[PDB]
Amino acid sequence: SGFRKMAFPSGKVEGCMVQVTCGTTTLNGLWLDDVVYCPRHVICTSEDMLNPNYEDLLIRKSNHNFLVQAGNVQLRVIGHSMQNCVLKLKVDTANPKTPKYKFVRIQPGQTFSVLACYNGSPSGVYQCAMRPNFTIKGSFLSGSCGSVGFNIDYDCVSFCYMHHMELPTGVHAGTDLEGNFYGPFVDRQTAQAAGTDTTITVNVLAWLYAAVINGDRWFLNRFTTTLNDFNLVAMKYNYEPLTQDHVDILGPLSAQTGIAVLDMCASLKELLQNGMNGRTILGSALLEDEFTPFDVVRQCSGVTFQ
Amino acid sequence: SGFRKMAFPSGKVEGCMVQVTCGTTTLNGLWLDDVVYCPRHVICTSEDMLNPNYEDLLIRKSNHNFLVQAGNVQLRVIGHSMQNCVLKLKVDTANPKTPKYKFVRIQPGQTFSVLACYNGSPSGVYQCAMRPNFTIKGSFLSGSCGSVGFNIDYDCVSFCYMHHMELPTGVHAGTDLEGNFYGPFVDRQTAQAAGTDTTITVNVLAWLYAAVINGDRWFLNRFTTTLNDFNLVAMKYNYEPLTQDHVDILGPLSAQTGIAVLDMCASLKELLQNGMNGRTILGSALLEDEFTPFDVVRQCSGVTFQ
Ligand SMILES: *C(=N)[C@H](C[C@@H]1CCNC1=O)NC(=O)[C@@H]1[C@@H]2[C@H](CN1C(=O)[C@@H](NC(=O)C(F)(F)F)C(C)(C)C)C2(C)C
Ligand SMILES: *C(=N)[C@H](C[C@@H]1CCNC1=O)NC(=O)[C@@H]1[C@@H]2[C@H](CN1C(=O)[C@@H](NC(=O)C(F)(F)F)C(C)(C)C)C2(C)C
């Protein structure tokens, strides 16, 4: 029983983390085989921050301008190249702690664990979701850049996020491990704002199923709804549109509970109208949207309380 | 900026988790030096757990009766003994991945990270608080027993919890690593209930300081109170007494924010009496009590461990 915002065990990612210094700028690197991946803005100065020409900044760099440190051991850079918004540093040593890995670009609503690091050293691990507006609600301070988001499937670490910047609203923006930003953001200190955020409807429905699996049913009602009527109401509370794809993905959780997806949709529709009335669901007074259908099936029972 | 429920990096513990099998029962073990620590009820059959005599059950067991599996290698047991509610299995090999560590017994309201494991394999990591009623609000299915709770002190892991059982309210009970239960519980399949819990007042105030640091301020007030008037209100809402210790411990947060402890106690008093008036604090509609003063200072000032 119980339900937690559970993170993946971080050990496979800790083993990859390095410190990268260019001039006075220090941030975190990801060391996989004989390549260190980091945010390209490690090569920026204070004057460069607004309108950096990265190609012009990089061309003035030698390999020995990059100081890469794995623990107290200095790695030796034998090559550098830029791919979109990531710097790729070729080093003379393959990381002996390299896990089975792959680079995946995730879609809004997808979750992952973040290993917040400073000076290539881990500070903590927490669970995040890619917001519909392509931000994450992270916990990042100075020196956290190059921190990475990941999932783990058996022994394989799928890297999906590298941290670049904080937006005015206190929310975070970053790239996949191929250096392409999520959302319309750019690695410049020019004025940028996150678009108005929405609630991840497919995830709230999953979390309500988790509540039923763990034996809570108070929020259920005797109603159903059409997919369209649900979306017309849901959009009025700043909820993501629920697609047929989302309904298909909730199929397994429907079967385990015996509650049709659109029956669960009628329950959510009621909760948005009524609030909580001093009650909680899985120890929350808000509808939680940072658990995916996969997260629920992973953490929850094959059986239900019932 | 940003504030997240953050676990310690789990890598140092991932390297210590093994699978322990006795007859048909399988659960998780902690492999440190040449000793494997696990719940003593691994020697029990499903029907022995009714009224187990662990003294009697163990004296009938031999070393080869304990199948201990680290990854793909079977370890050989050269001795077995009980300490309170934990079984200690002497093995042929000192764990080469053994971190610097100690066994620590924690107080209610103190937090730790739990590495959830199944068949000696880490599944997930989350942050917990020792409840005042000596339970944890964990997330545990069948086979999670022997999963451990820990804190990291620079490079030293302090082991504080071993998972033993789930109460009918869906909360969790276990021991320190010396096999002494937290709370009035016994490792028997007999009727047992969690005592009425209470809120950890020092943690809520600490969390309000984190909210202030991260720019959420609407709940502050011009009033002050005395400790004694606050505790009169606190106990009315089943909040823990706030001692002078607590006020001294929130010292480093009070000066750094410029908000006096008893002024923040005045803000808390108002939140309990009035509720939150449709508003949230760090994206929560409840008062969070699972962040310690130390936790807030540590996340908000960055950090590293080795
Ligand atoms: C990496 N070490 C930091 C991480 C930041 C610092 C505070 N919290 C974080 O997540 N990243 C940066 O310093 C990036 C970096 C220059 C400035 N920057 C920012 O995050 C800034 N924000 C923006 O420029 C904005 F608004 F456009 F997003 C800052 C004002 C410092 C928060 C570059 C090259 C984008
Ligand atoms: C260890 N692998 C499990 C973990 C449990 C299983 C369900 N969720 C968990 O957290 N521990 C147990 O199976 C322990 C074990 C016998 C019974 N038990 C329980 O957790 C049971 N509860 C109680 O005995 C109670 F209520 F008294 F606390 C159960 C009914 C299976 C939930 C022993 C020896 C205590």
Numbering used by the authors:
A (entry chain A), B (entry chain B): 1 to 306
Sentences from the paper on this structure:
The SARS-CoV-2 Main protease (Mpro) or 3C-like protease (3CLpro) is a dimeric cysteine protease responsible for the cleavage of the viral polyproteins 1a and 1ab in 11 sites, including its own N and C terminal. Mpro substrate recognition has unique features and is specific for Gln residue at P1, hydrophobic residues at P2, and small side chains such as Ser and Ala at P1’. The absence of similar sites in human proteases together with the importance of the enzyme for the viral replication makes Mpro a primary target for antiviral discovery and development. Herein, we evaluated the effect of single mutations in the active site of Mpro from circulating polymorphisms on the kinetics and inhibitory constants of nirmatrelvir and ensitrelvir.
For nirmatrelvir complexes, we determined the crystals structures of the WT enzyme, as well as M49I, N142S, G143S, Q189K, A193T, and A193S mutants at 2.1, 1.9, 1.8, 1.6, 2.4, 2.5, and 1.9-Å resolution, respectively. In general, nirmatrelvir exhibited a similar binding mode in all mutants, maintaining most of the key interactions with Mpro-binding site residues. For all, the electron densities around C145 clearly indicates the presence of a covalent bond between the nitrile carbon of nirmatrelvir and the Sγ atom of C145 (∼1.8 Å). Mutants M49I, M49T, N142S, M165I, R188K, T190I, A191T, and A193V showed higher susceptibility to nirmatrelvir, with Ki values ranging from 0.005 to 0.013 μM, a no more than 2-fold increase in Ki values relative to the WT. Mutants N142S, R188S, A191V, A193S, and A193T showed similar relative catalytic efficiencies to the WT. Mutants M49T, N142S, A191T, and A191V showed significantly diminished inhibitory constants against ensitrelvir, with 3- to 5-fold increase in Ki values relative to the WT.
